[model samples]
Target: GSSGSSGVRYFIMKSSNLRNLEISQQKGIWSTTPSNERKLNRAFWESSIVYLVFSVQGSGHFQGFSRMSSEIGREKSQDWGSAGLGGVFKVEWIRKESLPFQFAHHLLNPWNDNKKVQISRDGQELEPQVGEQLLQLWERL
Candidate 1:
């Protein structure tokens, strides 16, 4: 489908279900820190098309043509001490047990998709450094 933007195109796809699992750890502010983030799933579902809108605060808003309802939101830290930066995720599933067809369209979107995202303080728009370890972690997914 058209993204409604000349410079960028878009794709739409669908999957039966989705699951999200996350874990994190933090130490004292003064100490050198070591952290770990992992995805338990072997592979991610690829719909016919996925609409991503990246946000500064770290959330991906999503939409779909099929009646398959889903939710997308962000997890952030508060002044009480939630730890480093936060992340976003989407959880979607098929509600009806019986349907005329087996497939449905699902949309995986972000909160914001503007070009200025890279300059946003939330960190989605910034380019990764040459040897940044963060890229290494994503490779596992």
Candidate 2:
């Protein structure tokens, strides 16, 4: 859906059933930059399914989305150990069946429609207010 030149690209998988997201990169020249930083050098998410392995870090309460771009900037600019450099380890997405979630599945149908879209959970339609409340809770925590 997007592209970048020579910097770290961050990804976040938002799923109700998943608590933690696990990811690893494949080893190759394209996996990192010339400096040895952990990043996906050249990649595309539209053409092929980017496979990723899913796992949890611990029982720690799942925190909402953090600004990964800003985190990368701090790491590259301040840190010293291969901070501003890319490495040889390539990035890979491990796919697993247990992670139950859908992306743009029929939700984006008739894409031109600008109206608020409805989402179904547990076979029941979710109200906009409920969804908004849940989103707000996620942001707060």
Each candidate's lDDT (Cα)?
0.21, 0.25
Q: Under the 3 Å rule for N, CA and C atoms, how many clashes does model 1 have? A: 17
Which regions in candidate 2 have their CA more than 4 angstroms from the true location? 1-10, 13-56, 70-135, 139-141
Error of model 2, residue 28, in angstroms: 28
Global fold similarity of model 2 (TM-score): 0.20
Q: What is the lDDT of residue 101 in candidate 2?
A: 22
Error of 1 at 53 (Å): 15
Q: What are the per-model C-alpha RMSD values against the true structure? A: 17.4, 14.3
lDDT tens digits, residues 1-141, model 1?
655433311222212121111111121011001121111010122223222211212223121111111222222223222233333233232121221111211111233342222222221222222112212322333
